[PDB]
Design a protein around this ligand. Structure first.
Ligand SMILES: NCCCOc1ccc(-c2cn[nH]c2-c2cc(Cl)c(O)cc2O)cc1
Length: 212
């Protein structure tokens, strides 16, 4: 069962700009996604204090990055609180309206794209290196769902029936642009991670497949 929704105008406009903008330091995208993953983890951690049973679906709290060269895909996973179907719809397709509108105005005034995080809409920076994204999420309060968008003004939400079932959390599956495959490389990914992840209180796992 697939369902389609339209983004709030302001969000679509920001996405159009980001996916086409010529930025020379696109690696900032990872910083934003790592920060969001950390926030999701803090949320499940906090809630587990009085309700530890919430952790049983996925006992370990972590962030995991897995590049998939064969598919020109980069996955950023966290075992955070996750998002129900309603949360995916609202969080990624509506609530960012004000932040995106303000950031667009900031950019028009000369702001740098690296300021996106200051406006609470860092998520959309992924379109600097990807032309399509699948958000696979599993909240303890709902079934596993897939949110997907290619920056076409609309997005779809589908009951996950093809991906691996995760205990709890969210996976950002980025379909990298042909000229942004450097982020599939271990060395490159490692340097980008260490450059801004000093604050992360959770372990950041890197899964790489190398031939011996
Ligand atoms: N104004 C700042 C916006 C960031 O705030 C958050 C931070 C985390 C979440 C949240 C809850 N469950 N999953 C997420 C979540 C959201 C995004 Cl976009 C992400 O890349 C990873 C996540 O784990 C939701 C909102």
């Amino acid at each position: 069962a697939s369902e389609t929704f339209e983004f709030q105008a302001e969000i679509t406009q920001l996405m159009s700009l980001i996916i086409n903008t010529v930025y020379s330091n696109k690696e900032i995208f990872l910083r934003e996604l790592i920060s969001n993953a950390s926030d999701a983890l803090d949320k499940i951690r906090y809630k587990s204090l009085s309700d530890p049973k919430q952790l049983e679906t996925e006992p370990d709290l972590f962030i995991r990055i897995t590049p998939k060269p064969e598919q020109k895909v980069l996955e950023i996973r966290d075992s955070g609180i996750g998002m129900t179907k309603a949360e995916l719809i609202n969080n990624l397709g509506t609530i960012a309206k004000s932040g995106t509108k303000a950031f667009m105005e900031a950019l028009s005034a000369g702001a740098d794209v690296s300021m996106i995080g200051q406006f609470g809409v860092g998520f959309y920076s992924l379109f600097l290196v990807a032309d399509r994204v699948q958000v696979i999420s599993k909240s303890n309060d709902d079934e596993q769902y897939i949110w997907e968008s290619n920056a076409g003004g609309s997005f779809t939400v589908t009951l996950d029936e093809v991906n691996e079932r995760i205990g709890r959390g969210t996976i950002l599956r980025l379909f990298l642009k042909d000229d942004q495959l450097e982020y599939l490389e271990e060395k490159r990914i490692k340097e980008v991670i260490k450059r801004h992840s000093e604050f992360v209180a959770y372990p950041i796992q890197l899964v790489v497949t190398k031939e011996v």
